[PDB]
């Protein structure tokens, strides 16, 4: 049969937003303006302020998504090929690190709001994008034999969840889905919020988690790594103090949370 046969910064941000979301993993390079610094930080700050306001009003995920999604096209676009939007998103996150690393209360508020925004944007993805994003983060499934041995317990655990979360009211549909579903085994301490609600099966100190759940692990890893990075950011704030032109902006940004 027949057969034939700075740019680096732009490539970096294309790579960082191929997954459409990022853990915000890497040091930015090159330059932007100080006006851009202020405006981009304020835009992300407005979205996070509304997220915290809605959470203080005890609104649900669906309501917050209805409130916040129209704001992306104006303040902080998502699911976009534009280099400007990608740089705006990335840089605004990094700026608010330096604003909100300053104290435990600021770190907690910023981690909460940013993790909830992460959850919102992850919900906006297609399942293929979610899979690719999770795989890009280098993030144990059980064997078919172990699934067969624990099938009664796992099905008893997830059958209600399949009906209420995936709308599978028919038991036949639940059985077919369960036959196609994969399960993850990890220590129970890693998914303790699901343990307290008895949403996972426990055996010998390990929790058995279906593949259609477990986004709380992803968002908790995002929150934990962001908290550690903020602690690091706090430790080298004395180097930020070398440019005076940034400190009034950061003081202004933090004043809306104090």
């Amino acid at each position: 049969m027949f057969r034939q046969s700075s740019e680096e910064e732009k490539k970096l941000y294309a790579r960082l937003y191929e997954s459409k979301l990022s853990f915000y993993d890497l040091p930015p390079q090159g330059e932007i303006t100080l006006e851009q610094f202020e405006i981009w930080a304020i835009d992300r700050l407005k979205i996070l302020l509304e997220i915290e306001s809605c959470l203080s009003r005890n609104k649900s995920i669906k309501e917050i998504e209805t409130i916040i999604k129209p704001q992306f096209q104006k303040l902080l676009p998502f699911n976009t090929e534009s280099l400007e939007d990608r740089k705006k998103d990335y840089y605004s996150h990094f700026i608010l690190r330096l604003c909100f690393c300053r104290s435990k209360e600021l770190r907690e508020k910023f981690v909460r709001a940013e993790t909830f925004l992460f959850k919102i944007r992850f919900n906006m993805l297609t399942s293929t994008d979610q899979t690719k994003f999770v795989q890009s983060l280098d993030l144990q499934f059980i064997s078919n034999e172990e699934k067969a041995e624990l099938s009664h317990q796992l099905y008893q655990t997830v059958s209600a969840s399949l009906q209420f979360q995936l709308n599978l009211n028919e038991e036949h549909q639940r059985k077919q889905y369960f036959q196609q579903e994969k399960f993850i085994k990890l220590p129970f301490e890693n998914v303790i919020e699901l343990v307290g609600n008895r949403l996972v099966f426990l055996k010998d100190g390990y929790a058995y988690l279906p593949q259609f759940q477990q986004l709380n692990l992803l968002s908790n890893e995002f929150a934990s790594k962001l908290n550690q990075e903020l602690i690091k950011t706090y430790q080298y704030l004395p180097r930020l103090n070398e440019d005076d032109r940034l400190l009034p902006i950061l003081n202004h940004l933090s004043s809306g949370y104090t």
Binding site: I192, E193, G196, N197, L202
Partner: peptide
């Protein structure tokens, strides 16, 4: 176990 983890174990 942390306090959050203890509360969730207790809830379990």
């Amino acid at each position: 176990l942390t306090d959050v983890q203890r509360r969730n174990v207790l809830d379990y």
